[PDB]
């Protein structure tokens, strides 16, 4: 299976990558910008409530 | 005579109105109960879905 140098090439690029995975290597600030935009949009689709607790209701009777 | 008898019989069911009122109000309270339960379940599932999607 290692006969094809392509497999090993991909494999050890992958490995070096995982070792570098101490952080997302070469993310690039455009990565962060995309994250920013899509995370907002997701949040608005999910509302504005604090995403940490059980938002209380105090339900109203007739 | 028979008209008076008819009134007397009509008296028997003179309570049904309030029976209906009670049934309606009680079941409305039950409606609020159940919908509150379902709504809290909805909110919790949605809130955790946020993080799953993240």
UniProtKB/Swiss-Prot annotation, chain A:
The keyword Ion transport applies. GO terms for cellular component: mitochondrial inner membrane; mitochondrion; proton-transporting ATP synthase complex. The modification N6-succinyllysine is found at residue 48. GO terms for molecular function: proton transmembrane transporter activity. Component of the ATP synthase complex composed at least of ATP5F1A/subunit alpha, ATP5F1B/subunit beta, ATP5MC1/subunit c (homooctomer), MT-ATP6/subunit a, MT-ATP8/subunit 8, ATP5ME/subunit e, ATP5MF/subunit f, ATP5MG/subunit g, ATP5MK/subunit k, ATP5MJ/subunit j, ATP5F1C/subunit gamma, ATP5F1D/subunit delta, ATP5F1E/subunit epsilon, ATP5PF/subunit F6, ATP5PB/subunit b, ATP5PD/subunit d, ATP5PO/subunit OSCP. Belongs to the eukaryotic ATPase subunit F6 family. This is ATP synthase peripheral stalk subunit F6, mitochondrial. The gene is ATP5PF.
From Swiss-Prot, chain B:
The modification N6-acetyllysine is found at residues 5, 13. It comes from the Eukaryota. It is found in: Mitochondrion; Mitochondrion inner membrane. Coiled coil: none annotated. Component of the ATP synthase complex composed at least of ATP5F1A/subunit alpha, ATP5F1B/subunit beta, ATP5MC1/subunit c (homooctomer), MT-ATP6/subunit a, MT-ATP8/subunit 8, ATP5ME/subunit e, ATP5MF/subunit f, ATP5MG/subunit g, ATP5MK/subunit k, ATP5MJ/subunit j, ATP5F1C/subunit gamma, ATP5F1D/subunit delta, ATP5F1E/subunit epsilon, ATP5PF/subunit F6, ATP5PB/subunit b, ATP5PD/subunit d, ATP5PO/subunit OSCP. Subunit b, of the mitochondrial membrane ATP synthase complex (F(1)F(0) ATP synthase or Complex V) that produces ATP from ADP in the presence of a proton gradient across the membrane which is generated by electron transport complexes of the respiratory chain. ATP synthase complex consist of a soluble F(1) head domain - the catalytic core - and a membrane F(1) domain - the membrane proton channel. These two domains are linked by a central stalk rotating inside the F(1) region and a stationary peripheral stalk. Belongs to the eukaryotic ATPase B chain family. This is ATP synthase peripheral stalk subunit b, mitochondrial. It comes from Bos taurus. The lineage of its organism: Eukaryota, Metazoa, Chordata, Craniata, Vertebrata. The gene is ATP5PB. The chain holds residues 150 to 203 of 256 of the full protein.
């Amino acid at each position: 299976d290692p006969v094809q140098k392509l497999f090993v090439d991909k494999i050890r690029e992958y490995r070096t990558k995982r070792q570098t995975s101490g952080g997302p290597v070469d993310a690039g600030p455009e990565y962060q910008q995309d994250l920013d935009r899509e995370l907002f949009k997701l949040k608005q689709m999910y509302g504005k409530a604090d995403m940490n607790t059980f938002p209380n209701f105090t339900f109203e009777d007739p | 005579i028979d008209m008076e008898k008819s009134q007397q019989a009509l008296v028997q069911k003179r309570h049904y109105l309030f029976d209906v009122q009670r049934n309606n109000i009680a079941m409305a309270l039950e409606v609020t109960y159940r919908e509150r339960l379902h709504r809290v379940y909805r909110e919790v599932k949605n809130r955790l879905d946020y993080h799953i999607s993240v």
